Amino acid sequence: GDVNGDGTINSTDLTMLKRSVLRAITLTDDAKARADVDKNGSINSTDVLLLSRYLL
Amino acid sequence: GDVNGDGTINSTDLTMLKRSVLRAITLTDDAKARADVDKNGSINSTDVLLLSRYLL
Amino acid sequence: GDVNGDGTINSTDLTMLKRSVLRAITLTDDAKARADVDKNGSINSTDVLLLSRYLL
Amino acid sequence: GVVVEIGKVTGSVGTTVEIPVYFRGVPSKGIANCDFVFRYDPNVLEIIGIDPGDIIVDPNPTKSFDTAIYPDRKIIVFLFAEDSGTGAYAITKDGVFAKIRATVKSSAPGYITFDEVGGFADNDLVEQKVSFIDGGVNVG
Amino acid sequence: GVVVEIGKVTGSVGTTVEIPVYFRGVPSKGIANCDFVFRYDPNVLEIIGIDPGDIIVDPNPTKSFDTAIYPDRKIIVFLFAEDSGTGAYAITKDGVFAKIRATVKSSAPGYITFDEVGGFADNDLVEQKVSFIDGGVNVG
Amino acid sequence: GVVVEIGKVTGSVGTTVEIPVYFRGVPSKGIANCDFVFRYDPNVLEIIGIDPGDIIVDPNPTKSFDTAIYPDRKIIVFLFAEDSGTGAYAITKDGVFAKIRATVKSSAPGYITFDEVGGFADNDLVEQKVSFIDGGVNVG
Ligand SMILES: [Ca+2]
Ligand SMILES: [Ca+2]
Ligand SMILES: [Ca+2]
Ligand SMILES: [Ca+2]
Ligand SMILES: [Ca+2]
Ligand SMILES: [Ca+2]
Ligand SMILES: [Cl-]
Ligand SMILES: [Cl-]
Ligand SMILES: [Cl-]
Numbered sequence: 001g002d003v004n005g006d007g008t009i010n011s012t013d014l015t016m017l018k019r020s021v022l023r024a025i026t027l028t029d030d031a032k033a034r035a036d037v038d039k040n041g042s043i044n045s046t047d048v049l050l051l052s053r054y055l056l
Numbered sequence: 057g058d059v060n061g062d063g064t065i066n067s068t069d070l071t072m073l074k075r076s077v078l079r080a081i082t083l084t085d086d087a088k089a090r091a092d093v094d095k096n097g098s099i100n101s102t103d104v105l106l107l108s109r110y111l112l
Numbered sequence: 113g114d115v116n117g118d119g120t121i122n123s124t125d126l127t128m129l130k131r132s133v134l135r136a137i138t139l140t141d142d143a144k145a146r147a148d149v150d151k152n153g154s155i156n157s158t159d160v161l162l163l164s165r166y167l168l
Numbered sequence: 169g170v171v172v173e174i175g176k177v178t179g180s181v182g183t184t185v186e187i188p189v190y191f192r193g194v195p196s197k198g199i200a201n202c203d204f205v206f207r208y209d210p211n212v213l214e215i216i217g218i219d220p221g222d223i224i225v226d227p228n229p230t231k232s233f234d235t236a237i238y239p240d241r242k243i244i245v246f247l248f249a250e251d252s253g254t255g256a257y258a259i260t261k262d263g264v265f266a267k268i269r270a271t272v273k274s275s276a277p278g279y280i281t282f283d284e285v286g287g288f289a290d291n292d293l294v295e296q297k298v299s300f301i302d303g304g305v306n307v308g
Numbered sequence: 309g310v311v312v313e314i315g316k317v318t319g320s321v322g323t324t325v326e327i328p329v330y331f332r333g334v335p336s337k338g339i340a341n342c343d344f345v346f347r348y349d350p351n352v353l354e355i356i357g358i359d360p361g362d363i364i365v366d367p368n369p370t371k372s373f374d375t376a377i378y379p380d381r382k383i384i385v386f387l388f389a390e391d392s393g394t395g396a397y398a399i400t401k402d403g404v405f406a407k408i409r410a411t412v413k414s415s416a417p418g419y420i421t422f423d424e425v426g427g428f429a430d431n432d433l434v435e436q437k438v439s440f441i442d443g444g445v446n447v448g
Numbered sequence: 449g450v451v452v453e454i455g456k457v458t459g460s461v462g463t464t465v466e467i468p469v470y471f472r473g474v475p476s477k478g479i480a481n482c483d484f485v486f487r488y489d490p491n492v493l494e495i496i497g498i499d500p501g502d503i504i505v506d507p508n509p510t511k512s513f514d515t516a517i518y519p520d521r522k523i524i525v526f527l528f529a530e531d532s533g534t535g536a537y538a539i540t541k542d543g544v545f546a547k548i549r550a551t552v553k554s555s556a557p558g559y560i561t562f563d564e565v566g567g568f569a570d571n572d573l574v575e576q577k578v579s580f581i582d583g584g585v586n587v588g
Contacts, residue, residue, distance in 0.1 A: 004123075004127050004508065006123040006127065007513075008121075011060075011062040011063075013061050014265075015062065018084075018234065018247060019084065019245050020179065021203050021239070021244070021245075021286065022084050022204070022208055022234060022235070022236040022245045023085055023236060023241075023245050024081070024083070024236055025081075025136070025137075026070050026136050026515050026516070026518070027129075027136070028131065028134050028136055028514050028515065029497065029498060029514060029517065030510040030513075030514045030515075033510075036216050038293075040478060042286060042287075043286075044199055044203050044286030044287035045201040045202055045203035045248060045249050045286055045287040045288075045289075046286075046287035046289050046295070047266065047287070048201065048203075048249040048287075049200060049249040049250070049287075049293075050293075051199040051250060052251060052253075053253050056251075056253045056505040061230065067116075067118040067119075067327075071116050071118065074140075074374065074387060075140065076383075077343050077387050077426065078374060078376040078385045079138075079141050079345070079376060079378070079383070079385050080137070080138050080140055080376055082138070082236070084233045084234050084235065084236050085217065085218060085234060085235040085236060085237065086230040086233075086235075089230075091201075094275070094433075096355075097425075098426060099426075100426030100427035101341040101342055101343035101387055101388060101389050101405070101426055101427040101428075101429075102342050102426075102427035102429050102433065102437050103340055103407070103427070104341065104343075104387065104389040105340060105341040105389040105390070105427075105429075105433075106433075107395075108389060108391060109393050112391075112393045117370065117371075122467075130514065130527060133483050133525075133527050134514060134515070134516040134525045134527050134567065135485070135516060135518070135521075135523070135525050136516055138376070138378070140375065140376050141357065141358060141374060141375040141376060141377065142370040142373075142374045142375075145370075150573075152326050154482050154564075154566060154567075155479040156565035156567035157482055157483035157527055157528060157529050157566055157567040157568075157569075158481055158566075158569050158573065158575070159478060159567070159568075160481065160527065160529040161481040161529040161530070161569075161573075162573075164529060164531060164533075165533050167476030167533075168531075168533045
């Protein structure tokens with residue numbers, strides 16, 4: 001869940017994840033592993049749904 | 057004013073808006089509408105001025 | 113140290129600096145000067161080390 | 169399984185047309201999230217916006233639905249993830265998922281083709297089988 | 309209205325030169341904000357920096373003035389938005405808006421041309437009529 | 449000074465191979481931070497990941513070590529900056545700095561070459577002299 005790896009899971013992580021799936025930004029290799037919420041080897045809308053539900 | 061759409065208008069929004077005008081980043085289609093402060097169909101320095109004044 | 117120039121030096125600055133060195137993002141010309149922690153004309157891992165130590 | 173249909177429309181040069189994206193064969197559990205990339209020619213079509221269809225029921229549609237347009241990369245991206253937290257804003261019926269607004273720049277065929285699909289899951293977070301039909305503007 | 313002049317200079321290969329950007333016909337209400345994109349050839353000119361001119365009066369110029377250089381995209385971008393909150397740091401007189409520092413890499417003409425303009429408003433937030441004159445290095 | 453060696457390996461098309469990056473001649477003060485860019489051909493090699501070698505001793509290696517892969521830009525980037533705050537997680541011995549995991553897509557030589565180096569300093573923050581040896585997959 002901690003996309004940027006700053007130690008806290010918040011709205012900034014979800015924004016980075018959503019922008020990554022929308023291909024606006026690229027994530028670093030470390031961030032890619034942390035963005036993979038369900039750990040299935042891909043970063044997509046399923047991760048987005050899970051992280052957004054976690055924050056809500 | 058709420059560029060990233062996290063529910064709060066702060067310095068992070070202005071930074072995203074300024075970087076967008078400087079073409080450092082792209083905004084998503086949803087974010088584009090929210091970044092269009094004066095709602096004239098374009099995202100530019102006029103929006104930057106208005107948002108910066110709002111925060112100050 | 114204040115990469116984005118919002119008035120505070122925090123984790124957001126280090127993240128921007130690290131992503132810049134990893135070439136994930138570009139910094140604006142103003143931000144480039146502030147990201148150059150040791151002021152040697154280049155933005156690299158030495159700046160990363162110094163900023164991370166400052167925050168810790 | 170689920171069939172995603174990129175609509176086929178015709179239009180004159182200089183006019184703005186709407187290219188619907190259809191969701192066919194929506195399962196009983198519905199569709200809680202999906203993302204996919206379409207390819208297009210920026211010299212033929214200028215895509216100026218993408219709107220959510222009527223099958224997205226979120227009263228604040230931007231919370232569940234977002235898109236991006238990249239002319240330099242010749243792609244458009246869709247991101248849906250229902251934002252209720254309970255599965256309430258999931259797509260449950262067939263119809264228009266999205267509407268692509270494009271201004272026709274030339275008489276040449278304006279192909280909008282399937283490029284990549286990411287997640288495509290129901291309310292039980294089970295990934296669904298999905299197939300894509302290509303379309304566009306003046307492609308017939 | 310307002311005329312933006314990209315300066316024309318000459319210089320030897322291997323030297324760093326300064327290309328001034330002039331603001332002519334600044335209105336009585338002044339210029340509170342502006343943004344525009346210039347095109348250039350990275351094989352001919354290596355742009356290493358852009359500095360604000362003397363017509364920017366903000367004691368902390370980076371608060372009101374920022375730029376970006378993209379060699380891979382062959383463009384440079386300018387962003388001005390006076391940061392006083394009252395209109396105090398608006399441009400009120402004619403002269404040098406910015407100085408482009410470029411190292412000449414080859415003897416070929418180094419065109420710096422107008423590409424796009426966004427906002428360009430006075431202190432009453434009224435968008436001003438603006439025209440651009442192209443310039444560069446060794447273009448005469 | 450310090451010699452960075454891009455390993456040379458052989459492998460069949462369709463297999464995933466590991467290309468080690470060696471640090472030779474590590475100084476007595478060690479290496480607290482380094483960053484550099486390598487070039488490659490995405491049509492020949494599909495780089496799917498980069499892992500830190502055993503000479504990175506940080507128990508939480510991602511805090512000190514990070515990478516990025518850009519197929520569209522045909523480059524890979526390395527960022528090391530020891531995260532102890534005291535110099536405790538600095539590289540002090542010779543060996544494998546990183547392992548590049550790549551799937552071979554074609555029989556053509558898969559060059560991984562040195563492109564750019566940024567910082568490369570010891571625990572006293574003194575920039576070290578460094579040289580690079582190019583390598584890759586099926587390049588012999
Ligand atoms: Ca975080
Ligand atoms: Ca995943
Ligand atoms: Ca916000
Ligand atoms: Ca606007
Ligand atoms: Ca800051
Ligand atoms: Ca530096
Ligand atoms: Cl972001
Ligand atoms: Cl940003
Ligand atoms: Cl960032």
